[PDB]
Amino acid sequence: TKCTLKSFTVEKGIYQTSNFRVQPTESIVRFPNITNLCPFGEVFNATRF
Amino acid sequence: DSTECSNLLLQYGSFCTQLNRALTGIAVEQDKNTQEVFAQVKQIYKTPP
Ligand SMILES: *[C@@H]1O[C@H](CO)[C@@H](O)[C@H](O)[C@H]1NC(C)=O
Ligand SMILES: *[C@@H]1O[C@H](CO)[C@@H](O)[C@H](O)[C@H]1NC(C)=O
């Protein structure tokens, strides 16, 4: 509150300050687990263009 | 939920806090309007039976 009001004194009242959030508890990853390596050798190192 | 955006929003200074102040002035004024309109009576009178 003191930081939000930029003041060391604060009067009788109700003050918005920060906003509470439940923290992201773990970092989930969800991807198509397809096994093939992409054909980039046939993109860049092919015989002719 | 972005710290990166919330850093760039500090460059704009007190815009964000004065908007919350303005909306809080409005929001308290809605209670003030309601108090001024309805709370003109200092006792909760109740009817006879
Ligand atoms: C992806 O993983 C699940 C188990 O987590 C498995 O059942 C599924 O067959 C896998 N898909 C591929 C494309 O390998
Ligand atoms: C293309 O060939 C070179 C060797 O000539 C190799 O180092 C490189 O990794 C290859 N690139 C791809 C995308 O396969």
PDB file of N, CA and C and ligand atoms in Angstrom:
ATOM      1  N   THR A   1       0.821  -1.212   0.000  1.00  0.00           N
ATOM      2  CA  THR A   1       0.000   0.000   0.000  1.00  0.00           C
ATOM      3  C   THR A   1       0.851   1.256   0.000  1.00  0.00           C
ATOM      4  N   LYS A   2       1.853   1.345   0.882  1.00  0.00           N
ATOM      5  CA  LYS A   2       2.802   2.465   0.930  1.00  0.00           C
ATOM      6  C   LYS A   2       3.478   2.680  -0.422  1.00  0.00           C
ATOM      7  N   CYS A   3       3.935   1.615  -1.075  1.00  0.00           N
ATOM      8  CA  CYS A   3       4.484   1.720  -2.423  1.00  0.00           C
ATOM      9  C   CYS A   3       3.440   2.126  -3.462  1.00  0.00           C
ATOM     10  N   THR A   4       2.228   1.573  -3.407  1.00  0.00           N
ATOM     11  CA  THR A   4       1.163   1.902  -4.372  1.00  0.00           C
ATOM     12  C   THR A   4       0.763   3.376  -4.311  1.00  0.00           C
ATOM     13  N   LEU A   5       0.668   3.948  -3.111  1.00  0.00           N
ATOM     14  CA  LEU A   5       0.336   5.359  -2.908  1.00  0.00           C
ATOM     15  C   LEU A   5       1.551   6.298  -2.962  1.00  0.00           C
ATOM     16  N   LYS A   6       2.766   5.783  -3.208  1.00  0.00           N
ATOM     17  CA  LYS A   6       4.031   6.547  -3.163  1.00  0.00           C
ATOM     18  C   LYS A   6       4.162   7.375  -1.873  1.00  0.00           C
ATOM     19  N   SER A   7       3.790   6.808  -0.726  1.00  0.00           N
ATOM     20  CA  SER A   7       3.720   7.544   0.541  1.00  0.00           C
ATOM     21  C   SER A   7       4.007   6.664   1.751  1.00  0.00           C
ATOM     22  N   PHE A   8       4.699   7.207   2.752  1.00  0.00           N
ATOM     23  CA  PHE A   8       4.978   6.504   4.004  1.00  0.00           C
ATOM     24  C   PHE A   8       3.800   6.581   4.974  1.00  0.00           C
ATOM     25  N   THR A   9       3.067   7.694   5.003  1.00  0.00           N
ATOM     26  CA  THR A   9       1.763   7.749   5.679  1.00  0.00           C
ATOM     27  C   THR A   9       0.666   7.206   4.768  1.00  0.00           C
ATOM     28  N   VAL A  10      -0.290   6.458   5.323  1.00  0.00           N
ATOM     29  CA  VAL A  10      -1.521   6.034   4.641  1.00  0.00           C
ATOM     30  C   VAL A  10      -2.704   6.252   5.575  1.00  0.00           C
ATOM     31  N   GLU A  11      -3.791   6.838   5.091  1.00  0.00           N
ATOM     32  CA  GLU A  11      -4.984   7.142   5.885  1.00  0.00           C
ATOM     33  C   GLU A  11      -5.967   5.962   5.970  1.00  0.00           C
ATOM     34  N   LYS A  12      -6.919   6.026   6.908  1.00  0.00           N
ATOM     35  CA  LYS A  12      -8.025   5.066   7.055  1.00  0.00           C
ATOM     36  C   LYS A  12      -8.752   4.873   5.725  1.00  0.00           C
ATOM     37  N   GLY A  13      -8.742   3.663   5.177  1.00  0.00           N
ATOM     38  CA  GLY A  13      -9.382   3.388   3.891  1.00  0.00           C
ATOM     39  C   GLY A  13      -9.164   1.974   3.372  1.00  0.00           C
ATOM     40  N   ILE A  14      -9.678   1.709   2.179  1.00  0.00           N
ATOM     41  CA  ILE A  14      -9.452   0.477   1.431  1.00  0.00           C
ATOM     42  C   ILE A  14      -8.817   0.813   0.091  1.00  0.00           C
ATOM     43  N   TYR A  15      -7.673   0.214  -0.202  1.00  0.00           N
ATOM     44  CA  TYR A  15      -6.835   0.589  -1.335  1.00  0.00           C
ATOM     45  C   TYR A  15      -6.591  -0.612  -2.228  1.00  0.00           C
ATOM     46  N   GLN A  16      -6.852  -0.512  -3.525  1.00  0.00           N
ATOM     47  CA  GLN A  16      -6.313  -1.502  -4.451  1.00  0.00           C
ATOM     48  C   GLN A  16      -4.785  -1.439  -4.402  1.00  0.00           C
ATOM     49  N   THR A  17      -4.105  -2.576  -4.523  1.00  0.00           N
ATOM     50  CA  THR A  17      -2.640  -2.633  -4.587  1.00  0.00           C
ATOM     51  C   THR A  17      -2.209  -3.474  -5.783  1.00  0.00           C
ATOM     52  N   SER A  18      -1.524  -4.594  -5.581  1.00  0.00           N
ATOM     53  CA  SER A  18      -1.318  -5.576  -6.640  1.00  0.00           C
ATOM     54  C   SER A  18      -2.601  -6.385  -6.892  1.00  0.00           C
ATOM     55  N   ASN A  19      -2.549  -7.315  -7.835  1.00  0.00           N
ATOM     56  CA  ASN A  19      -3.603  -8.271  -8.133  1.00  0.00           C
ATOM     57  C   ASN A  19      -3.094  -9.677  -7.804  1.00  0.00           C
ATOM     58  N   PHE A  20      -3.783 -10.386  -6.911  1.00  0.00           N
ATOM     59  CA  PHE A  20      -3.421 -11.748  -6.541  1.00  0.00           C
ATOM     60  C   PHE A  20      -3.617 -12.663  -7.739  1.00  0.00           C
ATOM     61  N   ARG A  21      -2.681 -13.580  -7.967  1.00  0.00           N
ATOM     62  CA  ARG A  21      -2.835 -14.687  -8.910  1.00  0.00           C
ATOM     63  C   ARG A  21      -2.285 -15.961  -8.286  1.00  0.00           C
ATOM     64  N   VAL A  22      -2.998 -17.076  -8.417  1.00  0.00           N
ATOM     65  CA  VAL A  22      -2.402 -18.397  -8.171  1.00  0.00           C
ATOM     66  C   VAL A  22      -1.252 -18.597  -9.162  1.00  0.00           C
ATOM     67  N   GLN A  23      -0.087 -19.024  -8.684  1.00  0.00           N
ATOM     68  CA  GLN A  23       1.096 -19.163  -9.533  1.00  0.00           C
ATOM     69  C   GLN A  23       0.989 -20.378 -10.472  1.00  0.00           C
ATOM     70  N   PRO A  24       1.538 -20.311 -11.700  1.00  0.00           N
ATOM     71  CA  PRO A  24       1.700 -21.485 -12.550  1.00  0.00           C
ATOM     72  C   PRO A  24       2.576 -22.526 -11.840  1.00  0.00           C
ATOM     73  N   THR A  25       1.963 -23.614 -11.377  1.00  0.00           N
ATOM     74  CA  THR A  25       2.606 -24.535 -10.426  1.00  0.00           C
ATOM     75  C   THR A  25       3.648 -25.447 -11.088  1.00  0.00           C
ATOM     76  N   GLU A  26       3.415 -25.856 -12.338  1.00  0.00           N
ATOM     77  CA  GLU A  26       4.369 -26.562 -13.209  1.00  0.00           C
ATOM     78  C   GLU A  26       4.220 -26.088 -14.667  1.00  0.00           C
ATOM     79  N   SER A  27       5.229 -26.332 -15.508  1.00  0.00           N
ATOM     80  CA  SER A  27       5.273 -25.912 -16.917  1.00  0.00           C
ATOM     81  C   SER A  27       4.983 -27.076 -17.868  1.00  0.00           C
ATOM     82  N   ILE A  28       3.704 -27.284 -18.162  1.00  0.00           N
ATOM     83  CA  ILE A  28       3.186 -28.373 -18.995  1.00  0.00           C
ATOM     84  C   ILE A  28       3.505 -28.158 -20.476  1.00  0.00           C
ATOM     85  N   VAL A  29       3.834 -29.228 -21.193  1.00  0.00           N
ATOM     86  CA  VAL A  29       4.053 -29.200 -22.644  1.00  0.00           C
ATOM     87  C   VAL A  29       3.246 -30.319 -23.297  1.00  0.00           C
ATOM     88  N   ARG A  30       2.464 -29.992 -24.324  1.00  0.00           N
ATOM     89  CA  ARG A  30       1.529 -30.897 -25.009  1.00  0.00           C
ATOM     90  C   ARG A  30       1.703 -30.750 -26.513  1.00  0.00           C
ATOM     91  N   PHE A  31       2.311 -31.736 -27.153  1.00  0.00           N
ATOM     92  CA  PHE A  31       2.751 -31.680 -28.551  1.00  0.00           C
ATOM     93  C   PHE A  31       2.365 -32.974 -29.276  1.00  0.00           C
ATOM     94  N   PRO A  32       2.190 -32.965 -30.606  1.00  0.00           N
ATOM     95  CA  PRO A  32       2.063 -34.192 -31.380  1.00  0.00           C
ATOM     96  C   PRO A  32       3.406 -34.931 -31.361  1.00  0.00           C
ATOM     97  N   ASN A  33       3.461 -36.068 -30.674  1.00  0.00           N
ATOM     98  CA  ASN A  33       4.674 -36.857 -30.434  1.00  0.00           C
ATOM     99  C   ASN A  33       5.018 -37.766 -31.627  1.00  0.00           C
ATOM    100  N   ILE A  34       5.013 -37.190 -32.831  1.00  0.00           N
ATOM    101  CA  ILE A  34       5.389 -37.860 -34.078  1.00  0.00           C
ATOM    102  C   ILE A  34       6.910 -38.072 -34.152  1.00  0.00           C
ATOM    103  N   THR A  35       7.342 -39.234 -34.639  1.00  0.00           N
ATOM    104  CA  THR A  35       8.737 -39.695 -34.512  1.00  0.00           C
ATOM    105  C   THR A  35       9.660 -39.283 -35.663  1.00  0.00           C
ATOM    106  N   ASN A  36       9.123 -39.010 -36.856  1.00  0.00           N
ATOM    107  CA  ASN A  36       9.928 -38.781 -38.063  1.00  0.00           C
ATOM    108  C   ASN A  36      10.791 -37.517 -37.954  1.00  0.00           C
ATOM    109  N   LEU A  37      12.065 -37.583 -38.342  1.00  0.00           N
ATOM    110  CA  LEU A  37      12.862 -36.374 -38.569  1.00  0.00           C
ATOM    111  C   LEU A  37      12.437 -35.693 -39.877  1.00  0.00           C
ATOM    112  N   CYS A  38      12.267 -34.370 -39.872  1.00  0.00           N
ATOM    113  CA  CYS A  38      11.851 -33.642 -41.075  1.00  0.00           C
ATOM    114  C   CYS A  38      12.905 -33.709 -42.205  1.00  0.00           C
ATOM    115  N   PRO A  39      12.492 -33.721 -43.487  1.00  0.00           N
ATOM    116  CA  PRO A  39      13.346 -34.048 -44.636  1.00  0.00           C
ATOM    117  C   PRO A  39      14.235 -32.880 -45.101  1.00  0.00           C
ATOM    118  N   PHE A  40      14.803 -32.110 -44.177  1.00  0.00           N
ATOM    119  CA  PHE A  40      15.528 -30.876 -44.490  1.00  0.00           C
ATOM    120  C   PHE A  40      16.769 -31.097 -45.368  1.00  0.00           C
ATOM    121  N   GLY A  41      17.416 -32.261 -45.311  1.00  0.00           N
ATOM    122  CA  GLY A  41      18.477 -32.610 -46.265  1.00  0.00           C
ATOM    123  C   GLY A  41      17.984 -32.597 -47.715  1.00  0.00           C
ATOM    124  N   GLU A  42      16.762 -33.068 -47.961  1.00  0.00           N
ATOM    125  CA  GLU A  42      16.113 -32.999 -49.275  1.00  0.00           C
ATOM    126  C   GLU A  42      15.512 -31.617 -49.583  1.00  0.00           C
ATOM    127  N   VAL A  43      15.402 -30.723 -48.595  1.00  0.00           N
ATOM    128  CA  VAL A  43      15.091 -29.306 -48.834  1.00  0.00           C
ATOM    129  C   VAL A  43      16.336 -28.563 -49.323  1.00  0.00           C
ATOM    130  N   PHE A  44      17.441 -28.616 -48.571  1.00  0.00           N
ATOM    131  CA  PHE A  44      18.611 -27.759 -48.803  1.00  0.00           C
ATOM    132  C   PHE A  44      19.722 -28.409 -49.642  1.00  0.00           C
ATOM    133  N   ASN A  45      19.975 -29.711 -49.479  1.00  0.00           N
ATOM    134  CA  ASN A  45      21.116 -30.413 -50.088  1.00  0.00           C
ATOM    135  C   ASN A  45      20.714 -31.311 -51.279  1.00  0.00           C
ATOM    136  N   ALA A  46      19.498 -31.153 -51.813  1.00  0.00           N
ATOM    137  CA  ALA A  46      19.047 -31.856 -53.017  1.00  0.00           C
ATOM    138  C   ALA A  46      19.928 -31.547 -54.242  1.00  0.00           C
ATOM    139  N   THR A  47      19.959 -32.451 -55.223  1.00  0.00           N
ATOM    140  CA  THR A  47      20.895 -32.363 -56.357  1.00  0.00           C
ATOM    141  C   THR A  47      20.667 -31.113 -57.215  1.00  0.00           C
ATOM    142  N   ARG A  48      19.410 -30.750 -57.496  1.00  0.00           N
ATOM    143  CA  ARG A  48      19.028 -29.599 -58.338  1.00  0.00           C
ATOM    144  C   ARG A  48      17.824 -28.841 -57.774  1.00  0.00           C
ATOM    145  N   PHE A  49      17.758 -27.551 -58.098  1.00  0.00           N
ATOM    146  CA  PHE A  49      16.714 -26.602 -57.698  1.00  0.00           C
ATOM    147  C   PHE A  49      16.043 -25.996 -58.944  1.00  0.00           C
TER     148      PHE A  49
ATOM    149  N   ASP B   1      -0.801 -11.663 -17.241  1.00  0.00           N
ATOM    150  CA  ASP B   1       0.140 -12.791 -17.180  1.00  0.00           C
ATOM    151  C   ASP B   1       1.441 -12.644 -17.997  1.00  0.00           C
ATOM    152  N   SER B   2       1.781 -11.456 -18.509  1.00  0.00           N
ATOM    153  CA  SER B   2       3.096 -11.200 -19.107  1.00  0.00           C
ATOM    154  C   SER B   2       3.907 -10.177 -18.315  1.00  0.00           C
ATOM    155  N   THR B   3       5.059 -10.602 -17.803  1.00  0.00           N
ATOM    156  CA  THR B   3       6.051  -9.705 -17.199  1.00  0.00           C
ATOM    157  C   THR B   3       6.695  -8.802 -18.247  1.00  0.00           C
ATOM    158  N   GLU B   4       6.921  -9.293 -19.465  1.00  0.00           N
ATOM    159  CA  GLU B   4       7.558  -8.521 -20.542  1.00  0.00           C
ATOM    160  C   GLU B   4       6.707  -7.319 -20.941  1.00  0.00           C
ATOM    161  N   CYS B   5       5.423  -7.547 -21.198  1.00  0.00           N
ATOM    162  CA  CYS B   5       4.485  -6.462 -21.442  1.00  0.00           C
ATOM    163  C   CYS B   5       4.372  -5.551 -20.220  1.00  0.00           C
ATOM    164  N   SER B   6       4.290  -6.102 -19.008  1.00  0.00           N
ATOM    165  CA  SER B   6       4.189  -5.276 -17.802  1.00  0.00           C
ATOM    166  C   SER B   6       5.430  -4.412 -17.547  1.00  0.00           C
ATOM    167  N   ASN B   7       6.599  -4.760 -18.091  1.00  0.00           N
ATOM    168  CA  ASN B   7       7.770  -3.883 -18.073  1.00  0.00           C
ATOM    169  C   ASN B   7       7.609  -2.725 -19.057  1.00  0.00           C
ATOM    170  N   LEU B   8       7.235  -2.990 -20.310  1.00  0.00           N
ATOM    171  CA  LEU B   8       6.984  -1.923 -21.283  1.00  0.00           C
ATOM    172  C   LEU B   8       5.891  -0.958 -20.803  1.00  0.00           C
ATOM    173  N   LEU B   9       4.877  -1.437 -20.090  1.00  0.00           N
ATOM    174  CA  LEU B   9       3.846  -0.587 -19.496  1.00  0.00           C
ATOM    175  C   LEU B   9       4.367   0.344 -18.385  1.00  0.00           C
ATOM    176  N   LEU B  10       5.527   0.090 -17.769  1.00  0.00           N
ATOM    177  CA  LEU B  10       6.148   1.071 -16.863  1.00  0.00           C
ATOM    178  C   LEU B  10       6.668   2.305 -17.609  1.00  0.00           C
ATOM    179  N   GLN B  11       7.064   2.169 -18.877  1.00  0.00           N
ATOM    180  CA  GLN B  11       7.560   3.298 -19.665  1.00  0.00           C
ATOM    181  C   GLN B  11       6.497   4.387 -19.836  1.00  0.00           C
ATOM    182  N   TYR B  12       5.221   4.013 -19.825  1.00  0.00           N
ATOM    183  CA  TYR B  12       4.072   4.914 -19.917  1.00  0.00           C
ATOM    184  C   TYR B  12       3.729   5.592 -18.590  1.00  0.00           C
ATOM    185  N   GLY B  13       4.519   5.358 -17.548  1.00  0.00           N
ATOM    186  CA  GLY B  13       4.389   6.054 -16.282  1.00  0.00           C
ATOM    187  C   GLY B  13       3.038   5.831 -15.622  1.00  0.00           C
ATOM    188  N   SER B  14       2.483   6.897 -15.067  1.00  0.00           N
ATOM    189  CA  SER B  14       1.294   6.862 -14.219  1.00  0.00           C
ATOM    190  C   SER B  14      -0.033   6.801 -14.971  1.00  0.00           C
ATOM    191  N   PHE B  15      -0.059   6.532 -16.284  1.00  0.00           N
ATOM    192  CA  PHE B  15      -1.326   6.322 -17.002  1.00  0.00           C
ATOM    193  C   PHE B  15      -2.161   5.227 -16.353  1.00  0.00           C
ATOM    194  N   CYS B  16      -1.585   4.045 -16.195  1.00  0.00           N
ATOM    195  CA  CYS B  16      -2.273   2.890 -15.645  1.00  0.00           C
ATOM    196  C   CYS B  16      -2.850   3.202 -14.251  1.00  0.00           C
ATOM    197  N   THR B  17      -2.055   3.747 -13.332  1.00  0.00           N
ATOM    198  CA  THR B  17      -2.548   4.073 -11.985  1.00  0.00           C
ATOM    199  C   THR B  17      -3.581   5.192 -11.981  1.00  0.00           C
ATOM    200  N   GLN B  18      -3.472   6.227 -12.818  1.00  0.00           N
ATOM    201  CA  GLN B  18      -4.517   7.255 -12.850  1.00  0.00           C
ATOM    202  C   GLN B  18      -5.823   6.737 -13.463  1.00  0.00           C
ATOM    203  N   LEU B  19      -5.787   5.757 -14.371  1.00  0.00           N
ATOM    204  CA  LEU B  19      -7.010   5.101 -14.847  1.00  0.00           C
ATOM    205  C   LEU B  19      -7.690   4.332 -13.719  1.00  0.00           C
ATOM    206  N   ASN B  20      -6.950   3.535 -12.951  1.00  0.00           N
ATOM    207  CA  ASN B  20      -7.512   2.847 -11.785  1.00  0.00           C
ATOM    208  C   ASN B  20      -8.065   3.844 -10.768  1.00  0.00           C
ATOM    209  N   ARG B  21      -7.410   4.998 -10.585  1.00  0.00           N
ATOM    210  CA  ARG B  21      -7.908   6.084  -9.732  1.00  0.00           C
ATOM    211  C   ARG B  21      -9.224   6.641 -10.257  1.00  0.00           C
ATOM    212  N   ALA B  22      -9.317   6.928 -11.552  1.00  0.00           N
ATOM    213  CA  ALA B  22     -10.528   7.450 -12.182  1.00  0.00           C
ATOM    214  C   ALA B  22     -11.698   6.474 -12.055  1.00  0.00           C
ATOM    215  N   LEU B  23     -11.487   5.206 -12.411  1.00  0.00           N
ATOM    216  CA  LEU B  23     -12.494   4.161 -12.236  1.00  0.00           C
ATOM    217  C   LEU B  23     -12.858   3.969 -10.769  1.00  0.00           C
ATOM    218  N   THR B  24     -11.918   4.081  -9.837  1.00  0.00           N
ATOM    219  CA  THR B  24     -12.245   4.027  -8.406  1.00  0.00           C
ATOM    220  C   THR B  24     -13.084   5.224  -7.980  1.00  0.00           C
ATOM    221  N   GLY B  25     -12.810   6.420  -8.493  1.00  0.00           N
ATOM    222  CA  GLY B  25     -13.641   7.600  -8.253  1.00  0.00           C
ATOM    223  C   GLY B  25     -15.065   7.390  -8.749  1.00  0.00           C
ATOM    224  N   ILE B  26     -15.227   6.865  -9.967  1.00  0.00           N
ATOM    225  CA  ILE B  26     -16.533   6.452 -10.498  1.00  0.00           C
ATOM    226  C   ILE B  26     -17.176   5.423  -9.580  1.00  0.00           C
ATOM    227  N   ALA B  27     -16.451   4.371  -9.216  1.00  0.00           N
ATOM    228  CA  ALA B  27     -16.991   3.247  -8.481  1.00  0.00           C
ATOM    229  C   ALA B  27     -17.465   3.672  -7.094  1.00  0.00           C
ATOM    230  N   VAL B  28     -16.675   4.454  -6.365  1.00  0.00           N
ATOM    231  CA  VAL B  28     -17.110   5.043  -5.097  1.00  0.00           C
ATOM    232  C   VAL B  28     -18.275   5.985  -5.330  1.00  0.00           C
ATOM    233  N   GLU B  29     -18.275   6.737  -6.424  1.00  0.00           N
ATOM    234  CA  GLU B  29     -19.394   7.612  -6.717  1.00  0.00           C
ATOM    235  C   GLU B  29     -20.688   6.835  -6.955  1.00  0.00           C
ATOM    236  N   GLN B  30     -20.664   5.609  -7.480  1.00  0.00           N
ATOM    237  CA  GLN B  30     -21.894   4.827  -7.615  1.00  0.00           C
ATOM    238  C   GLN B  30     -22.497   4.504  -6.251  1.00  0.00           C
ATOM    239  N   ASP B  31     -21.665   4.160  -5.273  1.00  0.00           N
ATOM    240  CA  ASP B  31     -22.124   4.005  -3.897  1.00  0.00           C
ATOM    241  C   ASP B  31     -22.580   5.336  -3.316  1.00  0.00           C
ATOM    242  N   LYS B  32     -21.890   6.435  -3.616  1.00  0.00           N
ATOM    243  CA  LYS B  32     -22.296   7.765  -3.165  1.00  0.00           C
ATOM    244  C   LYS B  32     -23.654   8.158  -3.739  1.00  0.00           C
ATOM    245  N   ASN B  33     -23.888   7.961  -5.033  1.00  0.00           N
ATOM    246  CA  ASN B  33     -25.172   8.194  -5.681  1.00  0.00           C
ATOM    247  C   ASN B  33     -26.260   7.405  -4.971  1.00  0.00           C
ATOM    248  N   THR B  34     -26.009   6.123  -4.746  1.00  0.00           N
ATOM    249  CA  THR B  34     -26.958   5.233  -4.093  1.00  0.00           C
ATOM    250  C   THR B  34     -27.248   5.692  -2.673  1.00  0.00           C
ATOM    251  N   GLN B  35     -26.227   6.112  -1.933  1.00  0.00           N
ATOM    252  CA  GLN B  35     -26.363   6.662  -0.593  1.00  0.00           C
ATOM    253  C   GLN B  35     -27.176   7.959  -0.618  1.00  0.00           C
ATOM    254  N   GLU B  36     -26.881   8.869  -1.539  1.00  0.00           N
ATOM    255  CA  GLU B  36     -27.565  10.156  -1.688  1.00  0.00           C
ATOM    256  C   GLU B  36     -29.025  10.004  -2.097  1.00  0.00           C
ATOM    257  N   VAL B  37     -29.334   9.029  -2.949  1.00  0.00           N
ATOM    258  CA  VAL B  37     -30.699   8.753  -3.383  1.00  0.00           C
ATOM    259  C   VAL B  37     -31.491   8.042  -2.304  1.00  0.00           C
ATOM    260  N   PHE B  38     -31.027   6.892  -1.816  1.00  0.00           N
ATOM    261  CA  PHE B  38     -31.824   6.040  -0.934  1.00  0.00           C
ATOM    262  C   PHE B  38     -31.630   6.353   0.543  1.00  0.00           C
ATOM    263  N   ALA B  39     -30.405   6.596   1.003  1.00  0.00           N
ATOM    264  CA  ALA B  39     -30.104   6.780   2.425  1.00  0.00           C
ATOM    265  C   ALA B  39     -30.466   8.174   2.957  1.00  0.00           C
ATOM    266  N   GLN B  40     -31.464   8.821   2.360  1.00  0.00           N
ATOM    267  CA  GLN B  40     -31.997  10.096   2.840  1.00  0.00           C
ATOM    268  C   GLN B  40     -32.727   9.954   4.174  1.00  0.00           C
ATOM    269  N   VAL B  41     -33.055   8.723   4.560  1.00  0.00           N
ATOM    270  CA  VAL B  41     -33.687   8.396   5.832  1.00  0.00           C
ATOM    271  C   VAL B  41     -32.656   7.765   6.764  1.00  0.00           C
ATOM    272  N   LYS B  42     -32.487   8.345   7.954  1.00  0.00           N
ATOM    273  CA  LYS B  42     -31.418   7.968   8.895  1.00  0.00           C
ATOM    274  C   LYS B  42     -31.751   6.771   9.786  1.00  0.00           C
ATOM    275  N   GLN B  43     -33.004   6.332   9.783  1.00  0.00           N
ATOM    276  CA  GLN B  43     -33.500   5.154  10.484  1.00  0.00           C
ATOM    277  C   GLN B  43     -34.165   4.218   9.485  1.00  0.00           C
ATOM    278  N   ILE B  44     -34.058   2.907   9.659  1.00  0.00           N
ATOM    279  CA  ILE B  44     -34.891   1.992   8.891  1.00  0.00           C
ATOM    280  C   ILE B  44     -36.256   1.967   9.550  1.00  0.00           C
ATOM    281  N   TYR B  45     -37.150   2.837   9.101  1.00  0.00           N
ATOM    282  CA  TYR B  45     -38.547   2.726   9.479  1.00  0.00           C
ATOM    283  C   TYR B  45     -39.135   1.410   8.980  1.00  0.00           C
ATOM    284  N   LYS B  46     -40.054   0.833   9.750  1.00  0.00           N
ATOM    285  CA  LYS B  46     -40.843  -0.329   9.332  1.00  0.00           C
ATOM    286  C   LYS B  46     -42.323  -0.099   9.576  1.00  0.00           C
ATOM    287  N   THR B  47     -43.146  -0.756   8.766  1.00  0.00           N
ATOM    288  CA  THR B  47     -44.600  -0.568   8.743  1.00  0.00           C
ATOM    289  C   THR B  47     -45.237  -0.989  10.064  1.00  0.00           C
ATOM    290  N   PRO B  48     -46.445  -0.507  10.379  1.00  0.00           N
ATOM    291  CA  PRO B  48     -47.310  -1.212  11.319  1.00  0.00           C
ATOM    292  C   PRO B  48     -47.630  -2.634  10.809  1.00  0.00           C
ATOM    293  N   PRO B  49     -48.166  -3.519  11.665  1.00  0.00           N
ATOM    294  CA  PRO B  49     -48.681  -4.811  11.231  1.00  0.00           C
ATOM    295  C   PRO B  49     -49.989  -4.665  10.438  1.00  0.00           C
TER     296      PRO B  49
HETATM  297  C1  LIG C   1       2.323 -40.432 -27.865  1.00  0.00           C
HETATM  298  O1  LIG C   1       2.487 -40.853 -26.473  1.00  0.00           O
HETATM  299  C2  LIG C   1       1.390 -41.722 -25.971  1.00  0.00           C
HETATM  300  C3  LIG C   1       1.697 -42.080 -24.514  1.00  0.00           C
HETATM  301  O2  LIG C   1       1.943 -40.860 -23.792  1.00  0.00           O
HETATM  302  C4  LIG C   1       1.267 -42.959 -26.876  1.00  0.00           C
HETATM  303  O3  LIG C   1       0.103 -43.719 -26.484  1.00  0.00           O
HETATM  304  C5  LIG C   1       1.087 -42.562 -28.350  1.00  0.00           C
HETATM  305  O4  LIG C   1       1.024 -43.767 -29.163  1.00  0.00           O
HETATM  306  C6  LIG C   1       2.249 -41.662 -28.800  1.00  0.00           C
HETATM  307  N1  LIG C   1       2.053 -41.233 -30.188  1.00  0.00           N
HETATM  308  C7  LIG C   1       2.977 -41.386 -31.133  1.00  0.00           C
HETATM  309  C8  LIG C   1       2.700 -40.669 -32.464  1.00  0.00           C
HETATM  310  O5  LIG C   1       3.982 -42.074 -30.954  1.00  0.00           O
HETATM  311  C1  LIG C   2      24.052 -30.404 -45.994  1.00  0.00           C
HETATM  312  O1  LIG C   2      25.363 -31.015 -46.256  1.00  0.00           O
HETATM  313  C2  LIG C   2      26.455 -30.598 -45.338  1.00  0.00           C
HETATM  314  C3  LIG C   2      27.740 -31.332 -45.742  1.00  0.00           C
HETATM  315  O2  LIG C   2      27.966 -31.126 -47.150  1.00  0.00           O
HETATM  316  C4  LIG C   2      26.036 -30.902 -43.892  1.00  0.00           C
HETATM  317  O3  LIG C   2      27.028 -30.370 -42.990  1.00  0.00           O
HETATM  318  C5  LIG C   2      24.693 -30.241 -43.553  1.00  0.00           C
HETATM  319  O4  LIG C   2      24.326 -30.594 -42.189  1.00  0.00           O
HETATM  320  C6  LIG C   2      23.599 -30.686 -44.539  1.00  0.00           C
HETATM  321  N1  LIG C   2      22.351 -29.974 -44.236  1.00  0.00           N
HETATM  322  C7  LIG C   2      21.179 -30.584 -44.080  1.00  0.00           C
HETATM  323  C8  LIG C   2      19.981 -29.671 -43.791  1.00  0.00           C
HETATM  324  O5  LIG C   2      21.066 -31.804 -44.157  1.00  0.00           O
END
